[PDB]
Scaffold this active site. Structure first.
Site, PDB file in Angstrom:
ATOM      1  N   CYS B  32       0.636  22.717   5.587  1.00  0.00           N
ATOM      2  CA  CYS B  32       1.749  22.167   4.827  1.00  0.00           C
ATOM      3  C   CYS B  32       1.502  20.719   4.406  1.00  0.00           C
ATOM      4  O   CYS B  32       1.429  19.825   5.248  1.00  0.00           O
ATOM      5  CB  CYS B  32       3.047  22.264   5.628  1.00  0.00           C
ATOM      6  SG  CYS B  32       4.454  21.555   4.766  1.00  0.00           S
ATOM      7  N   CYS B  35       4.088  18.006   5.471  1.00  0.00           N
ATOM      8  CA  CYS B  35       3.942  17.741   6.903  1.00  0.00           C
ATOM      9  C   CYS B  35       2.859  16.700   7.166  1.00  0.00           C
ATOM     10  O   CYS B  35       3.026  15.805   7.998  1.00  0.00           O
ATOM     11  CB  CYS B  35       3.578  19.023   7.652  1.00  0.00           C
ATOM     12  SG  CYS B  35       4.921  20.204   7.775  1.00  0.00           S
TER      13      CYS B  35
END
Lengths: 105, 105
Positions: B32, B35
């Protein structure tokens, strides 16, 4: 029928086999509630719409594919045609999914 | 520094170790983008604030924890204090995160 993509190679093959049909890809995880909620609806839609190809990618199994498609909020639906991105939908909104299918096939 | 929770027992251990301190838990995945972009900000916050404990949970490594906390978007921040859930934040919104920290610590 919603075909489960095995890997990057398999993903490419499916996008090729689609030909000129709209392809809808469901990026999901087995630990994600909304994903499991909408999965049966996607299965039902795929049984009727023979002219759209429906695929699903388990992000925990195909982390490389997930990283390539900038996935973040699950389920994410990616809309593609001829190997090219058309649209994307975050979340399990069935009505928005139908509107995007209608628009893109 | 942000401690990575290894499993469910380790999660309880960290929550106990935090004592009365607000605990911020980052649920993330290595695939991600958002993230990865916010991870260094959390490291600085972790190093800077002594009255808040920061933890992280890799959803690919702890799928059980992800499911039991009903994570759906990456990253998701869970805010806990004395074992109680106080708040949750979906997405890499650092300002909202700081806001919930100042409020709950």
């Amino acid at each position: 029928m919603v075909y489960q993509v095995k890997d990057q190679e398999d993903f490419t093959k499916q996008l090729n086999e689609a030909g000129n049909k709209l392809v809808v890809i469901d990026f999901y995880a087995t630990w994600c509630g909304p994903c499991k909620m909408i999965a049966p609806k996607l299965e039902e839609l795929s049984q009727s719409m023979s002219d759209v190809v429906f695929l699903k990618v388990d992000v925990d199994e195909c982390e490389d594919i997930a990283q390539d498609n900038q996935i973040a909020c699950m389920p994410t639906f990616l809309f593609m045609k001829n190997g090219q991105k058309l649209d994307s939908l975050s979340g399990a909104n069935y009505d928005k999914l139908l509107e995007l299918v209608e628009k893109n096939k």
